[PDB]
Amino acid sequence: PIVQNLQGQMVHQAISPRTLNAWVKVVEEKAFSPEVIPMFSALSEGATPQDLNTMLNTVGGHQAAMQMLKETINEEAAEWDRLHPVHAGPIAPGQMREPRGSDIAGTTSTLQEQIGWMTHNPPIPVGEIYKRWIILGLNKIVRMYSPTSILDIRQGPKEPFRDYVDRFYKTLRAEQASQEVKNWMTETLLVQNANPDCKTILKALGPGATLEEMMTACQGVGGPGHKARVL
């Protein structure tokens, strides 16, 4: 996309086909995985709403669900319209048309225009905002894929603390409320959801006990394998 050259002049450039295929590729195996969210952003570095839109557009398969995201984007754009394009709606002539919500999606902007409002006048990160919307949509997506609820998380005596923790964290990643809530719930559930046999050892850990200490001790008792069994 637009990148500052040695001279520093930003020049539009086509996305690396390799990257393109890779984006779809990571999705191929981990289409709904949460780790994708950061990844998309990473792949979205320096992305332009147009080419960027293309990246999502290029994606297929489960994308039917993504269509929902398309709507989500539309929704963010809708609110956005009220938030910024509506800041003035009609504006005085002689200046680049402020990015309207439609323009943000790039549905109503020329590549040159996108580049123009983006770097000509004070830096306009249509991509960041648009992407910001996307990440939220993705936030909803991982939730869509969410197979279980934190409450549904429970370790069996035959089950490993590793899977419990892993899945717990796995769900935790998809968990809504921040550590403010998450930590509180996590602290209680770490012990409560845990299986009885390991729970004995976890109980032994008692209050405090960092997850590390817990993992270390659990490891000592073979808790991440099945339960308090040495291994």
Side-chain angles (χ1 to χ4, degrees):
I2 49 170
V3 295
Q4 60 188 302
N5 289 340
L6 279 71
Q7 290 172 331
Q9 291 171 331
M10 298 178 184
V11 179
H12 187 75
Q13 184 175 31
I15 56 176
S16 183
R18 183 178 67 181
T19 297
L20 222 185
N21 289 339
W23 168 232
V24 171
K25 181 179 180 180
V26 293
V27 172
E28 181 62 20
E29 292 175 350
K30 296 179 180 179
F32 289 103
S33 297
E35 64 184 288
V36 171
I37 273 168
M39 182 176 286
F40 169 78
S41 180
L43 296 174
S44 298
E45 289 174 349
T48 303
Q50 185 63 55
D51 289 347
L52 181 60
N53 182 351
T54 301
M55 290 173 69
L56 291 170
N57 192 34
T58 300
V59 172
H62 75 286
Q63 153 168 262
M66 190 181 289
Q67 298 300 297
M68 181 186 74
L69 192 141
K70 202 78 213 185
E71 183 180 2
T72 299
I73 291 170
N74 192 33
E75 182 178 0
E76 291 300 311
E79 290 172 347
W80 177 253
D81 184 68
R82 289 175 177 176
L83 290 170
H84 270 77
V86 156
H87 88 282
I91 190 170
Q95 292 172 330
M96 266 69 173
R97 183 175 294 174
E98 279 69 25
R100 292 186 180 189
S102 183
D103 293 319
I104 291 284
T107 58
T108 48
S109 68
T110 305
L111 178 62
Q112 290 172 331
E113 286 287 348
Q114 206 144 81
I115 293 169
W117 71 54
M118 183 169 184
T119 61
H120 184 270
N121 82 72
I124 304 302
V126 281
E128 183 178 0
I129 291 168
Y130 181 78
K131 181 166 63 177
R132 189 175 186 174
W133 302 347
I134 291 170
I135 291 169
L136 291 170
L138 291 169
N139 193 36
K140 291 179 180 179
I141 288 282
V142 291
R143 182 172 177 170
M144 183 272 286
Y145 186 78
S146 187
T148 65
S149 298
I150 282 285
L151 180 62
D152 289 346
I153 305 301
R154 59 192 297 273
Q155 179 179 220
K158 65 180 180 179
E159 293 182 358
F161 198 77
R162 186 182 299 173
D163 287 347
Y164 167 69
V165 171
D166 184 359
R167 291 180 182 181
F168 176 81
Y169 271 109
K170 186 72 172 182
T171 300
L172 191 71
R173 280 277 187 175
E175 185 62 21
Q176 279 181 296
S178 297
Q179 63 184 12
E180 291 300 314
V181 175
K182 252 191 267 188
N183 184 3
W184 182 255
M185 291 291 283
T186 296
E187 182 177 0
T188 299
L189 268 52
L190 277 163
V191 176
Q192 182 176 1
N193 287 346
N195 64 37
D197 290 341
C198 188
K199 178 181 289 186
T200 299
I201 300 301
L202 291 168
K203 186 177 181 64
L205 266 289
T210 62
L211 265 287
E212 180 274 334
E213 183 176 0
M214 181 179 287
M215 264 287 200
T216 299
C218 289
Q219 183 179 359
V221 299
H226 293 286
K227 47 182 177 181
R229 278 184 61 194
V230 298
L231 251 151

